[PDB]
PDB file of C-alpha atoms in Angstrom:
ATOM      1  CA  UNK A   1     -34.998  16.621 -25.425  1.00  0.00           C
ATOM      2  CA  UNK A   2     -35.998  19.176 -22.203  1.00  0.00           C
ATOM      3  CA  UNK A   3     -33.899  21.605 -23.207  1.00  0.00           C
ATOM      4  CA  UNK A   4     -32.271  23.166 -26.456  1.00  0.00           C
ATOM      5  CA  UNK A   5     -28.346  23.223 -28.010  1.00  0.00           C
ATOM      6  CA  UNK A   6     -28.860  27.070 -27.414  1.00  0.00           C
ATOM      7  CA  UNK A   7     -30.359  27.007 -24.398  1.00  0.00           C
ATOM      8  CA  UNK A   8     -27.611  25.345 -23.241  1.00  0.00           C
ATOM      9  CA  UNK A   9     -25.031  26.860 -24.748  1.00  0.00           C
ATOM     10  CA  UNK A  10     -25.931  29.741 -22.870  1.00  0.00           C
ATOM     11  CA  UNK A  11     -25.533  27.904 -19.072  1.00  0.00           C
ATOM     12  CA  UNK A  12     -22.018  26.791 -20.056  1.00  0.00           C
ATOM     13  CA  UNK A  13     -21.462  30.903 -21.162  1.00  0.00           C
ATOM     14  CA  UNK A  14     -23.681  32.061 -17.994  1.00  0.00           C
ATOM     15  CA  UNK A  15     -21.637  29.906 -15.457  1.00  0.00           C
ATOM     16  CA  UNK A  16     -18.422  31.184 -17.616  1.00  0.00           C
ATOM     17  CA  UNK A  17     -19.562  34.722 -17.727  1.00  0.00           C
ATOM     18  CA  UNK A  18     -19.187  33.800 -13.378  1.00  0.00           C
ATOM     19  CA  UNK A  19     -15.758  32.018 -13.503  1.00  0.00           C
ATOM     20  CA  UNK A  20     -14.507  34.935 -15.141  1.00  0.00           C
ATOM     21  CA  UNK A  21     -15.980  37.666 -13.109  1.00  0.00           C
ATOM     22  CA  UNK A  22     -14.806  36.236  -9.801  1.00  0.00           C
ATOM     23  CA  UNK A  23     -11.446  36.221 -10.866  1.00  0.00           C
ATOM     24  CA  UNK A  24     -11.683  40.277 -12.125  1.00  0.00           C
ATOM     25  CA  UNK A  25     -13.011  40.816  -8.894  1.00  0.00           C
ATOM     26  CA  UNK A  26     -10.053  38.867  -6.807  1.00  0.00           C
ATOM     27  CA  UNK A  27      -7.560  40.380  -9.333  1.00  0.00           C
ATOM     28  CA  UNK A  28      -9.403  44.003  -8.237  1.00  0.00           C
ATOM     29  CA  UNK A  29      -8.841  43.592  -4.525  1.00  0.00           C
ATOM     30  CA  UNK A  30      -5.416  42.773  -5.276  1.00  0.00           C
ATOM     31  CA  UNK A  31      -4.431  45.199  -7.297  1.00  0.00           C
ATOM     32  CA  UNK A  32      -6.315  48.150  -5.236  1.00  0.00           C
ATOM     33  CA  UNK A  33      -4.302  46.607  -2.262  1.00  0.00           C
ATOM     34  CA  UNK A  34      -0.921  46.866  -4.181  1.00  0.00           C
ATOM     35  CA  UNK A  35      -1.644  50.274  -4.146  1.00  0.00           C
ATOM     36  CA  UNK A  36      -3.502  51.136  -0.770  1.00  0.00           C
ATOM     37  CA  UNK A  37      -0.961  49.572   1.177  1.00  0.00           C
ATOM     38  CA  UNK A  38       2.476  48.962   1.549  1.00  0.00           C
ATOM     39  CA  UNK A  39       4.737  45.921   0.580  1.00  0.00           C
ATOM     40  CA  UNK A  40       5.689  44.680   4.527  1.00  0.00           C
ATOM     41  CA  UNK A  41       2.031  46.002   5.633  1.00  0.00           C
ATOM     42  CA  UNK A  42       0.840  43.362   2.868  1.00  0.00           C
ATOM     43  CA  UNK A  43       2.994  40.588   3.682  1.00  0.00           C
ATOM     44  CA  UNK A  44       1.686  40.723   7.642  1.00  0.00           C
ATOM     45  CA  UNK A  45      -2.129  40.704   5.871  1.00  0.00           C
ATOM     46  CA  UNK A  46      -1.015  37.549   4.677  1.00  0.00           C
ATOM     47  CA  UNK A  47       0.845  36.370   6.995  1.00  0.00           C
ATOM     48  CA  UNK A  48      -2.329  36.880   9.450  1.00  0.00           C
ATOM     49  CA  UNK A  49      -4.878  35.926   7.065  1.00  0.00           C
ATOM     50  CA  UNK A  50      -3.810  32.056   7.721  1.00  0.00           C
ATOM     51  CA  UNK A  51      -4.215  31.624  11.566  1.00  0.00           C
ATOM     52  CA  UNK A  52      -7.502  34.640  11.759  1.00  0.00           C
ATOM     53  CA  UNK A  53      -8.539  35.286   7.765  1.00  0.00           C
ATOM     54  CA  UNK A  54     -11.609  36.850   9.153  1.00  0.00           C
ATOM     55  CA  UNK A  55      -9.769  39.639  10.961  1.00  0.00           C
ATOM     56  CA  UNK A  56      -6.975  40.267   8.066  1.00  0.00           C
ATOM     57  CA  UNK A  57     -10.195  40.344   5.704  1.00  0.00           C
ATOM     58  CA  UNK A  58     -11.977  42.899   8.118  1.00  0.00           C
ATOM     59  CA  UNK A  59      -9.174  45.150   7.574  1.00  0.00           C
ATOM     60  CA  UNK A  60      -8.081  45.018   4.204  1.00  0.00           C
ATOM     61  CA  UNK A  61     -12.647  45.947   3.602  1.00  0.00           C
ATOM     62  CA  UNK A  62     -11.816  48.164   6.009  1.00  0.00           C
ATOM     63  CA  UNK A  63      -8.626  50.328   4.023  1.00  0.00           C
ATOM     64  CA  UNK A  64     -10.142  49.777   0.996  1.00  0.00           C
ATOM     65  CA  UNK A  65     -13.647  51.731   1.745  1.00  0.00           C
ATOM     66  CA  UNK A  66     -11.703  54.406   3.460  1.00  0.00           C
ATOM     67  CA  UNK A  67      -8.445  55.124   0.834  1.00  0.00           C
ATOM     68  CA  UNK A  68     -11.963  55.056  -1.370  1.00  0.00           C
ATOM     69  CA  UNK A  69     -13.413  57.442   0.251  1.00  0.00           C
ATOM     70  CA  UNK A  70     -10.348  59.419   1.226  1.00  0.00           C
ATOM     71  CA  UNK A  71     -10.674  59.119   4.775  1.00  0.00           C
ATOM     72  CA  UNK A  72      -6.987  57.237   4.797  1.00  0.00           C
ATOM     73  CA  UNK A  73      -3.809  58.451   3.311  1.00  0.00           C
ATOM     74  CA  UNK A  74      -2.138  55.869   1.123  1.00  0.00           C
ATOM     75  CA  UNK A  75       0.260  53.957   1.235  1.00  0.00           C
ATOM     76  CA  UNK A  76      -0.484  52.557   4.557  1.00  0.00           C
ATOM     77  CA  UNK A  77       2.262  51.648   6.301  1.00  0.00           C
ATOM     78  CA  UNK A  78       2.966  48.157   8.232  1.00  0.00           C
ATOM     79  CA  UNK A  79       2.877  50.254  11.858  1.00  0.00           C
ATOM     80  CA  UNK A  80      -0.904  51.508  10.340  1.00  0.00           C
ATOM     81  CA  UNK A  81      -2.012  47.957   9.549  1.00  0.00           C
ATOM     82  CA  UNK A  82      -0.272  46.092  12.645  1.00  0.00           C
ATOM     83  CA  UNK A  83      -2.532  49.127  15.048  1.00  0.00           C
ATOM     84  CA  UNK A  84      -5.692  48.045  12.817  1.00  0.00           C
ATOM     85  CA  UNK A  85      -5.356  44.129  13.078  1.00  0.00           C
ATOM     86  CA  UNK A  86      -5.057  45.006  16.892  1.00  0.00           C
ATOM     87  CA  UNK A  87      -8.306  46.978  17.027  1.00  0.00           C
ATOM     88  CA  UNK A  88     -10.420  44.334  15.234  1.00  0.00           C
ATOM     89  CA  UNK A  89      -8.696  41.388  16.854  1.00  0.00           C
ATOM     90  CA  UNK A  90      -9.824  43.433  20.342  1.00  0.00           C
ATOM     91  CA  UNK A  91     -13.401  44.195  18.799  1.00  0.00           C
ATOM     92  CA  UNK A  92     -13.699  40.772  17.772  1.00  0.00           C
ATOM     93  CA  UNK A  93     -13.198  39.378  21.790  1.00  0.00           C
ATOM     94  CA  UNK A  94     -15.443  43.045  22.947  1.00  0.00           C
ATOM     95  CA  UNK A  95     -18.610  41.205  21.019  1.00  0.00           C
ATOM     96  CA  UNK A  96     -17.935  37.981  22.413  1.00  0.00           C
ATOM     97  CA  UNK A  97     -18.246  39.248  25.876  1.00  0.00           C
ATOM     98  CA  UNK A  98     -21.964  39.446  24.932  1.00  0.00           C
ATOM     99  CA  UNK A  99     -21.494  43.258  25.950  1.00  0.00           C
TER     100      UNK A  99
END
């Protein structure tokens, strides 16, 4: 009654329209990392991403507005990453200090 068989077929498209746009966007990233940054700099990402996402997340934003913007020279190799995850890890605990 409230509402029409168009009208609604158009929320199930609208909120599929989403579903599928998300995953473009996570397939994207994924591929733009492939291709950033190398295969054992990727697997640390990862491999840091499940004890401190936050910090592997800051970088990977981090290489991908930069190799963008040709600021960074890729591939970016593992010793590149490892410094990075370093620097925000120690920028993370410099803002905690409340300083």
């Amino acid at each position: 009654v409230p509402i029409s068989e168009e009208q609604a077929q158009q929320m199930v498209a609208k909120q599929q329209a989403q579903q599928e746009r998300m995953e473009a966007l996570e397939e994207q990233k994924e591929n733009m990392l492939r291709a950033f940054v190398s295969a054992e700099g990727r697997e640390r990402l990862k491999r840091i991403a499940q004890v401190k996402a936050g910090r592997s997340q800051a970088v990977e934003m981090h290489i991908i507005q930069a190799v963008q913007r040709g600021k960074m020279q890729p591939p970016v190799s593992d010793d590149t990453v490892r410094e990075l995850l370093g620097q925000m890890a120690n920028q993370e605990a410099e803002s905690r200090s409340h300083i």
